[PDB]
Amino acid sequence: ASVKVAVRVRPFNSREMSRDSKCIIQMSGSTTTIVNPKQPKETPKSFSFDYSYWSHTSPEDINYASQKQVYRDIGEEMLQHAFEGYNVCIFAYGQTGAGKSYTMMGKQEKDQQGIIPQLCEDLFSRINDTTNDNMSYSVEVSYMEIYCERVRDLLNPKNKGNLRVREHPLLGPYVEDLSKLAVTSYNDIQDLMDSGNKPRTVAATTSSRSHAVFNIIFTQKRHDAETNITTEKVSKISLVDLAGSERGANINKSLTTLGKVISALAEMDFIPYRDSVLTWLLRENLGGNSRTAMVAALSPADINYDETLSTLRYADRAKQIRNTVSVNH
Numbered sequence: 001a002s003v004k005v006a007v008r009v010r011p012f013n014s015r016e017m018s019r020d021s022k023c024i025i026q027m028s029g030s031t032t033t034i035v036n037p038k039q040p041k042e043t044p045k046s047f048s049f050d051y052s053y054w055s056h057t058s059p060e061d062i063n064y065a066s067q068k069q070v071y072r073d074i075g076e077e078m079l080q081h082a083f084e085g086y087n088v089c090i091f092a093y094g095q096t097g098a099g100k101s102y103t104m105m106g107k108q109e110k111d112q113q114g115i116i117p118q119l120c121e122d123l124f125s126r127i128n129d130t131t132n133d134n135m136s137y138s139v140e141v142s143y144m145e146i147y148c149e150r151v152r153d154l155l156n157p158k159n160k161g162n163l164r165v166r167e168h169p170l171l172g173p174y175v176e177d178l179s180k181l182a183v184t185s186y187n188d189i190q191d192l193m194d195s196g197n198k199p200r201t202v203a204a205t206t207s208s209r210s211h212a213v214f215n216i217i218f219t220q221k222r223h224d225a226e227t228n229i230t231t232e233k234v235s236k237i238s239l240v241d242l243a244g245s246e247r248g249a250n251i252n253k254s255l256t257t258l259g260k261v262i263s264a265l266a267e268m269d270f271i272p273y274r275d276s277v278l279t280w281l282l283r284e285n286l287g288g289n290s291r292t293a294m295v296a297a298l299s300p301a302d303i304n305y306d307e308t309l310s311t312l313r314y315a316d317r318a319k320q321i322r323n324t325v326s327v328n329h
Ligand SMILES: Nc1ncnc2c1ncn2[C@@H]1O[C@H](COP(=O)(O)OP(=O)(O)NP(=O)(O)O)[C@@H](O)[C@H]1O
Pocket: 009, 010, 011, 013, 055, 094, 095, 096, 097, 098, 099, 100, 101, 102, 103, 207, 208, 242, 243, 244, 245, 297
Protein backbone atom coordinates (compact mmCIF):
# COMPACT_ATOMS: atom_id res chain seq x y z
CA ALA A 1 0.00 0.00 0.00
CA SER A 2 1.71 3.16 -1.28
CA VAL A 3 1.34 6.43 0.60
CA LYS A 4 -1.43 8.53 -0.99
CA VAL A 5 -0.53 12.23 -1.39
CA ALA A 6 -2.71 15.32 -1.78
CA VAL A 7 -1.71 18.95 -2.29
CA ARG A 8 -3.95 21.87 -1.50
CA VAL A 9 -3.44 25.50 -2.43
CA ARG A 10 -5.07 28.14 -0.23
CA PRO A 11 -6.08 31.77 -0.97
CA PHE A 12 -3.57 34.62 -0.62
CA ASN A 13 -2.89 35.73 2.99
CA SER A 14 -2.38 39.31 4.23
CA ARG A 15 1.40 39.12 3.85
CA GLU A 16 1.05 38.10 0.22
CA MET A 17 -1.59 40.54 -0.86
CA SER A 18 0.47 43.33 0.71
CA ARG A 19 3.33 42.32 -1.57
CA ASP A 20 1.09 42.14 -4.61
CA SER A 21 1.96 38.46 -4.91
CA LYS A 22 1.06 36.65 -8.10
CA CYS A 23 -0.16 33.03 -8.13
CA ILE A 24 2.61 30.69 -9.24
CA ILE A 25 0.59 27.56 -8.67
CA GLN A 26 -1.54 26.00 -11.41
CA MET A 27 -3.71 22.90 -11.18
CA SER A 28 -5.13 20.70 -13.93
CA GLY A 29 -6.49 17.23 -13.27
CA SER A 30 -4.01 15.52 -10.93
CA THR A 31 -1.16 17.78 -12.07
CA THR A 32 0.31 20.71 -10.18
CA THR A 33 2.58 23.16 -11.99
CA ILE A 34 4.62 25.80 -10.21
CA VAL A 35 6.14 28.82 -11.93
CA ASN A 36 9.46 30.38 -10.99
CA PRO A 37 8.78 34.14 -10.58
CA LYS A 38 12.57 34.65 -10.45
CA GLN A 39 13.22 32.89 -13.74
CA PRO A 40 9.98 33.40 -15.73
CA LYS A 41 11.45 31.91 -18.90
CA GLU A 42 12.71 28.74 -17.22
CA THR A 43 10.40 25.79 -17.87
CA PRO A 44 7.68 25.41 -15.17
CA LYS A 45 7.81 22.42 -12.79
CA SER A 46 4.90 19.99 -12.78
CA PHE A 47 4.10 17.29 -10.25
CA SER A 48 1.66 14.35 -10.34
CA PHE A 49 -0.46 13.64 -7.25
CA ASP A 50 -3.32 11.42 -6.12
CA TYR A 51 -5.35 14.49 -5.12
CA SER A 52 -5.03 18.12 -6.25
CA TYR A 53 -7.04 20.60 -4.24
CA TRP A 54 -7.54 24.01 -5.80
CA SER A 55 -8.69 26.17 -2.89
CA HIS A 56 -7.16 29.48 -3.98
CA THR A 57 -10.48 31.19 -4.75
CA SER A 58 -13.79 30.74 -2.97
CA PRO A 59 -16.71 28.25 -2.79
CA GLU A 60 -18.57 30.45 -5.28
CA ASP A 61 -16.10 29.01 -7.77
CA ILE A 62 -17.15 25.82 -9.56
CA ASN A 63 -13.58 24.49 -9.42
CA TYR A 64 -13.04 25.26 -5.74
CA ALA A 65 -12.28 22.44 -3.29
CA SER A 66 -14.14 22.82 -0.03
CA GLN A 67 -13.50 21.42 3.41
CA LYS A 68 -16.37 19.04 2.83
CA GLN A 69 -15.06 17.98 -0.59
CA VAL A 70 -11.52 17.44 0.68
CA TYR A 71 -12.90 15.30 3.50
CA ARG A 72 -15.37 13.37 1.36
CA ASP A 73 -12.43 12.38 -0.84
CA ILE A 74 -9.33 11.36 1.05
CA GLY A 75 -11.19 11.63 4.37
CA GLU A 76 -13.85 8.96 3.74
CA GLU A 77 -11.25 6.88 1.91
CA MET A 78 -9.10 6.56 5.03
CA LEU A 79 -12.08 6.20 7.35
CA GLN A 80 -13.18 3.23 5.23
CA HIS A 81 -9.78 1.53 5.64
CA ALA A 82 -10.20 2.07 9.34
CA PHE A 83 -13.55 0.29 9.06
CA GLU A 84 -11.79 -2.42 7.03
CA GLY A 85 -9.54 -2.90 10.05
CA TYR A 86 -6.40 -1.14 8.92
CA ASN A 87 -4.37 1.28 10.96
CA VAL A 88 -4.73 4.66 9.27
CA CYS A 89 -2.88 7.94 9.18
CA ILE A 90 -3.41 11.33 7.59
CA PHE A 91 -0.84 14.02 8.23
CA ALA A 92 -0.69 17.61 6.93
CA TYR A 93 2.77 18.91 5.95
CA GLY A 94 3.99 22.21 4.52
CA GLN A 95 5.32 25.73 4.95
CA THR A 96 4.39 27.83 7.97
CA GLY A 97 1.01 29.32 7.16
CA ALA A 98 0.37 27.09 4.13
CA GLY A 99 -2.90 25.83 5.57
CA LYS A 100 -2.11 22.66 7.50
CA SER A 101 -4.42 23.35 10.42
CA TYR A 102 -7.23 24.72 8.31
CA THR A 103 -7.18 21.44 6.47
CA MET A 104 -6.96 19.19 9.58
CA MET A 105 -9.02 21.15 12.08
CA GLY A 106 -10.60 24.01 10.18
CA LYS A 107 -12.93 26.37 12.05
CA GLN A 108 -15.57 25.15 14.48
CA GLU A 109 -17.97 27.44 12.66
CA LYS A 110 -20.43 27.20 9.73
CA ASP A 111 -19.03 25.19 6.80
CA GLN A 112 -15.34 25.50 7.87
CA GLN A 113 -14.60 22.10 9.71
CA GLY A 114 -11.42 20.25 8.71
CA ILE A 115 -10.66 16.54 8.23
CA ILE A 116 -10.46 15.65 11.92
CA PRO A 117 -13.88 17.01 12.95
CA GLN A 118 -15.55 15.58 9.84
CA LEU A 119 -14.01 12.14 10.30
CA CYS A 120 -15.14 11.95 13.94
CA GLU A 121 -18.71 12.86 12.95
CA ASP A 122 -18.75 10.39 10.03
CA LEU A 123 -17.25 7.66 12.30
CA PHE A 124 -19.96 8.06 14.91
CA SER A 125 -22.68 8.49 12.31
CA ARG A 126 -21.77 5.17 10.71
CA ILE A 127 -21.53 3.38 14.04
CA ASN A 128 -24.95 4.66 15.04
CA ASP A 129 -26.44 3.36 11.75
CA THR A 130 -25.35 -0.21 12.52
CA THR A 131 -28.24 -2.66 12.43
CA ASN A 132 -26.38 -5.86 13.28
CA ASP A 133 -26.89 -6.45 17.00
CA ASN A 134 -23.91 -8.82 16.93
CA MET A 135 -21.70 -5.77 16.39
CA SER A 136 -20.63 -3.47 19.22
CA TYR A 137 -18.11 -0.62 19.18
CA SER A 138 -15.63 1.29 21.32
CA VAL A 139 -13.97 4.64 20.53
CA GLU A 140 -11.05 5.88 22.63
CA VAL A 141 -9.30 9.16 21.99
CA SER A 142 -5.94 10.73 22.77
CA TYR A 143 -4.60 14.12 21.74
CA MET A 144 -1.02 15.25 22.24
CA GLU A 145 1.38 18.05 21.39
CA ILE A 146 5.03 17.75 20.46
CA TYR A 147 7.25 20.79 20.89
CA CYS A 148 11.05 20.64 21.12
CA GLU A 149 10.81 16.86 21.46
CA ARG A 150 8.55 17.32 24.49
CA VAL A 151 5.15 15.61 24.65
CA ARG A 152 2.10 17.24 26.24
CA ASP A 153 -1.20 15.55 26.92
CA LEU A 154 -3.70 17.96 25.33
CA LEU A 155 -6.53 16.10 27.06
CA ASN A 156 -5.08 16.77 30.47
CA PRO A 157 -3.77 20.36 30.93
CA LYS A 158 -3.83 19.98 34.72
CA ASN A 159 -0.65 17.94 34.12
CA LYS A 160 2.38 20.21 33.58
CA GLY A 161 4.90 17.41 33.14
CA ASN A 162 5.93 16.39 29.64
CA LEU A 163 5.25 12.69 28.98
CA ARG A 164 7.92 10.11 28.21
CA VAL A 165 8.04 8.41 24.84
CA ARG A 166 8.96 4.78 25.30
CA GLU A 167 9.34 1.60 23.25
CA HIS A 168 7.18 -1.29 24.45
CA PRO A 169 9.43 -4.37 24.27
CA LEU A 170 6.84 -6.06 22.02
CA LEU A 171 4.14 -3.58 21.06
CA GLY A 172 6.09 -0.60 19.72
CA PRO A 173 6.38 3.08 20.72
CA TYR A 174 3.85 4.77 23.00
CA VAL A 175 3.56 7.83 25.20
CA GLU A 176 3.58 6.99 28.89
CA ASP A 177 0.52 8.00 30.92
CA LEU A 178 -1.02 9.64 27.86
CA SER A 179 -4.73 9.98 28.52
CA LYS A 180 -6.82 7.65 26.37
CA LEU A 181 -10.48 8.49 26.84
CA ALA A 182 -13.53 6.51 25.84
CA VAL A 183 -16.30 8.43 24.07
CA THR A 184 -19.76 7.24 23.02
CA SER A 185 -20.83 10.19 20.89
CA TYR A 186 -19.62 12.74 18.35
CA ASN A 187 -20.43 15.62 20.73
CA ASP A 188 -18.29 14.18 23.45
CA ILE A 189 -15.28 13.65 21.20
CA GLN A 190 -15.88 17.15 19.81
CA ASP A 191 -15.95 18.79 23.25
CA LEU A 192 -12.66 16.90 23.89
CA MET A 193 -11.34 18.21 20.55
CA ASP A 194 -12.20 21.84 21.33
CA SER A 195 -10.71 21.47 24.83
CA GLY A 196 -7.53 20.19 23.25
CA ASN A 197 -7.31 22.93 20.62
CA LYS A 198 -7.53 25.54 23.39
CA PRO A 199 -4.81 23.92 25.48
CA ARG A 200 -2.41 23.98 22.54
CA THR A 201 0.48 26.31 22.95
CA VAL A 202 0.68 28.78 20.30
CA ALA A 203 1.04 31.85 22.29
CA ALA A 204 3.17 34.67 20.89
CA THR A 205 6.72 34.17 22.14
CA THR A 206 4.79 33.89 16.39
CA SER A 207 4.11 30.74 14.31
CA SER A 208 3.48 27.12 15.41
CA ARG A 209 6.56 25.15 16.40
CA SER A 210 4.65 22.18 17.75
CA HIS A 211 3.00 19.15 16.13
CA ALA A 212 -0.44 17.87 17.18
CA VAL A 213 -1.41 14.19 16.96
CA PHE A 214 -5.08 13.14 17.24
CA ASN A 215 -5.44 9.40 17.90
CA ILE A 216 -8.65 7.34 17.76
CA ILE A 217 -8.55 3.70 18.72
CA PHE A 218 -11.60 2.33 16.90
CA THR A 219 -12.53 -1.18 18.07
CA GLN A 220 -15.09 -3.41 16.33
CA LYS A 221 -16.42 -6.33 18.35
CA ARG A 222 -18.27 -9.07 16.45
CA HIS A 223 -20.38 -11.43 18.55
CA ASP A 224 -20.76 -15.03 17.33
CA ALA A 225 -24.00 -16.74 18.37
CA GLU A 226 -23.34 -20.39 19.28
CA THR A 227 -20.10 -20.05 21.14
CA ASN A 228 -19.44 -17.00 23.24
CA ILE A 229 -16.13 -15.68 21.96
CA THR A 230 -15.91 -12.11 20.71
CA THR A 231 -13.41 -11.45 17.93
CA GLU A 232 -12.02 -7.92 18.11
CA LYS A 233 -11.08 -5.83 15.09
CA VAL A 234 -8.87 -2.89 16.03
CA SER A 235 -7.60 0.03 13.96
CA LYS A 236 -5.67 3.08 15.08
CA ILE A 237 -6.47 6.39 13.44
CA SER A 238 -3.63 8.90 13.57
CA LEU A 239 -4.47 12.42 12.32
CA VAL A 240 -1.36 14.61 12.32
CA ASP A 241 -0.97 18.36 11.97
CA LEU A 242 2.74 19.22 11.92
CA ALA A 243 4.55 22.50 12.43
CA GLY A 244 5.36 24.43 9.32
CA SER A 245 8.70 23.61 7.72
CA GLU A 246 8.42 27.36 7.73
CA ARG A 247 9.85 30.38 5.93
CA GLY A 248 21.42 23.14 18.67
CA ALA A 249 17.88 23.17 17.27
CA ASN A 250 15.66 20.69 19.11
CA ILE A 251 12.66 22.80 18.12
CA ASN A 252 12.99 21.47 14.60
CA LYS A 253 14.56 18.00 14.99
CA SER A 254 11.31 16.10 14.32
CA LEU A 255 10.63 18.03 11.15
CA THR A 256 14.17 17.70 9.77
CA THR A 257 14.22 14.04 10.64
CA LEU A 258 10.74 13.54 9.15
CA GLY A 259 12.26 14.65 5.86
CA LYS A 260 15.13 12.18 6.15
CA VAL A 261 12.90 9.24 6.98
CA ILE A 262 10.59 10.20 4.11
CA SER A 263 13.52 10.34 1.67
CA ALA A 264 15.28 7.20 2.94
CA LEU A 265 11.98 5.29 2.68
CA ALA A 266 11.50 6.64 -0.86
CA GLU A 267 15.02 5.46 -1.67
CA MET A 268 14.30 1.92 -0.43
CA ASP A 269 19.56 0.17 5.33
CA PHE A 270 18.49 1.70 8.64
CA ILE A 271 16.36 4.74 9.37
CA PRO A 272 16.69 7.42 12.09
CA TYR A 273 13.09 6.93 13.29
CA ARG A 274 14.58 7.28 16.78
CA ASP A 275 16.27 10.60 15.91
CA SER A 276 13.04 12.36 16.91
CA VAL A 277 9.86 11.85 18.93
CA LEU A 278 7.66 12.57 15.89
CA THR A 279 9.23 9.94 13.67
CA TRP A 280 9.62 7.41 16.50
CA LEU A 281 5.91 7.46 17.37
CA LEU A 282 4.67 7.44 13.79
CA ARG A 283 7.24 4.85 12.79
CA GLU A 284 4.61 2.27 11.91
CA ASN A 285 2.56 4.83 9.98
CA LEU A 286 5.57 5.81 7.87
CA GLY A 287 7.07 2.48 6.90
CA GLY A 288 4.86 0.09 8.88
CA ASN A 289 1.46 -1.63 8.81
CA SER A 290 -0.62 1.43 8.08
CA ARG A 291 -2.60 3.03 5.29
CA THR A 292 -0.95 6.41 5.17
CA ALA A 293 -1.73 9.62 3.33
CA MET A 294 -0.03 12.98 3.26
CA VAL A 295 -1.75 16.29 2.63
CA ALA A 296 0.72 18.92 1.46
CA ALA A 297 -0.38 22.54 2.05
CA LEU A 298 0.98 25.16 -0.33
CA SER A 299 1.07 28.94 -0.55
CA PRO A 300 -0.02 30.27 -3.91
CA ALA A 301 2.41 33.23 -3.70
CA ASP A 302 5.53 33.92 -5.74
CA ILE A 303 7.36 35.12 -2.61
CA ASN A 304 7.26 31.52 -1.29
CA TYR A 305 8.63 29.74 -4.37
CA ASP A 306 11.52 27.98 -2.65
CA GLU A 307 9.42 26.84 0.28
CA THR A 308 6.60 25.58 -1.94
CA LEU A 309 8.89 23.86 -4.45
CA SER A 310 10.51 22.22 -1.39
CA THR A 311 7.07 20.97 -0.27
CA LEU A 312 6.22 19.63 -3.72
CA ARG A 313 9.47 17.66 -3.76
CA TYR A 314 8.87 16.04 -0.38
CA ALA A 315 5.27 15.42 -1.38
CA ASP A 316 6.62 13.75 -4.56
CA ARG A 317 9.00 11.49 -2.55
CA ALA A 318 6.23 10.32 -0.21
CA LYS A 319 4.31 8.93 -3.18
CA GLN A 320 7.22 6.52 -3.73
CA ILE A 321 6.70 5.13 -0.22
CA ARG A 322 5.27 1.64 0.04
CA ASN A 323 4.02 -0.07 3.19
CA THR A 324 3.11 -3.71 3.82
CA VAL A 325 -0.40 -3.66 5.24
CA SER A 326 -2.58 -6.27 6.88
CA VAL A 327 -6.00 -6.00 8.53
CA ASN A 328 -6.00 -6.39 12.30
CA HIS A 329 -8.48 -9.13 13.32
N1 LIG B 1 -8.53 26.60 2.05
C1 LIG B 1 -8.48 27.64 2.78
N2 LIG B 1 -9.51 28.56 2.74
C2 LIG B 1 -9.56 29.72 3.49
N3 LIG B 1 -8.62 30.07 4.33
C3 LIG B 1 -7.57 29.18 4.41
C4 LIG B 1 -7.46 28.01 3.70
N4 LIG B 1 -6.29 27.40 4.05
C5 LIG B 1 -5.70 28.19 4.94
N5 LIG B 1 -6.43 29.30 5.21
C6 LIG B 1 -6.12 30.43 6.14
O1 LIG B 1 -4.77 30.79 6.03
C7 LIG B 1 -4.03 30.76 7.32
C8 LIG B 1 -3.05 29.51 7.39
O2 LIG B 1 -3.78 28.61 8.23
P1 LIG B 1 -3.26 27.31 9.05
O3 LIG B 1 -3.78 28.19 10.13
O4 LIG B 1 -4.09 26.66 8.03
O5 LIG B 1 -1.70 27.44 8.70
P2 LIG B 1 -0.50 26.33 8.91
O6 LIG B 1 -1.54 25.63 9.66
O7 LIG B 1 -0.43 26.53 7.48
N6 LIG B 1 0.29 27.42 9.80
P3 LIG B 1 1.53 27.18 10.83
O8 LIG B 1 1.10 26.18 11.85
O9 LIG B 1 1.94 28.52 11.39
O10 LIG B 1 2.70 26.56 9.94
C9 LIG B 1 -5.21 30.84 8.32
O11 LIG B 1 -5.49 32.21 8.62
C10 LIG B 1 -6.36 30.11 7.59
O12 LIG B 1 -7.65 30.58 8.04
